[PDB]
């Protein structure tokens with residue numbers, strides 16, 4: 777396991793999302809679902825001008841896997857995925873510009889639900905999650921697991937867990953009081969209301 781520090785502005789954003797009073801937390805699902813859709817758009821394209829990219833799985837989709845036992849909600853996509861570099865730089869250093877653009881817009885009329893407009897929508901996961909684990913596999917690199925419970929740092933290690941083919945799974949280890957996001961009808965409700973017209977199939981797994 778390697779340990780890295782969040783660039784100071786990214787750390788300030790995460791303390792903000794984690795510590796600000798905002799009751800409309802359900803937007804986090806919309807924001808993960810959009811990120812997934814974007815990454816699937818990206819492998820779709822890269823496969824037109826190259827059909828070998830789908831050698832790692834031709835199905836382009838999004839699965840929603842709640843788990844009451846583990847108290848996790850996992851969003852999985854068969855999108856482009858991230859290489860070691862994307863994972864490290866994106867998540868922990870390069871969101872610097874967007875966070876500034878976002879925090880600069882909050883103290884200027886914006887509200888938290890506008891986070892994705894500045895490309896930092898991933899961090900809205902900290903509204904319901906105490907820990908986020910990201911599993912990713914890029915055609916060009918091996919499988920990685922990124923993790924953070926905030927606190928100014930994150931970890932990157934090689935993923936021992938089952939291979940996924942190509943894609944990303946964001947595992948949200950929910951806060952004690954947000955278990956309603958492990959509920960079929962509640963997930964169904966947020967998707968219908970927020971992600972109704974996503975161009976890839978969204979499957980909500982059932983428990984047991």
Ligand SMILES: Nc1nc(Cl)cc(-c2cc(OCCN3CCOCC3)c(Cl)cc2Cl)n1
Nearest residue numbers: 811812815857858866867870871895898944
């Ligand atoms: N589902 C999914 N798939 C991929 Cl390939 C990436 C991500 C993802 C994207 C993120 O940010 C994208 C926008 N910017 C990219 C450059 O770095 C700043 C952010 C983030 Cl932050 C996290 C994930 Cl998991 N999620």
